[PDB]
Amino acid sequence: GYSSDTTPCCFAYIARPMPRAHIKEYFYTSGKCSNPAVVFVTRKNRQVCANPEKKWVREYINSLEMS
């Protein structure tokens, strides 16, 4: 018995790294989704799916976590 609310999932990963300065937040999609995904939130508040195994993705997360 879980939420009956929708939850965002990803079905494709952005191919090339987004400019780091345009990203302000990230989150991981629900473990219920078929794919693991990182979602980068841009400064124009768009949400972009990214491959959590990619090097640049892991670096961006580390950078967003540091401050």
Next chain:
Amino acid sequence: GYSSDTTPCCFAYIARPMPRAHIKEYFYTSGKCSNPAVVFVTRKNRQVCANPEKKWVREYINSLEMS
């Protein structure tokens, strides 16, 4: 291939019918999602997953479709 945007998916259905007056509109979730679903959008913009096979759910869509 798909876009790298997120997509709302459903993982549980609301058991009992919600009040018809609270519903603004509906949409079906993407066939990319593993569970088929209708999403009912309330006046406060809540997105509630529902089972399209269920009688009350198809009555509500018909009501939001014919007018």
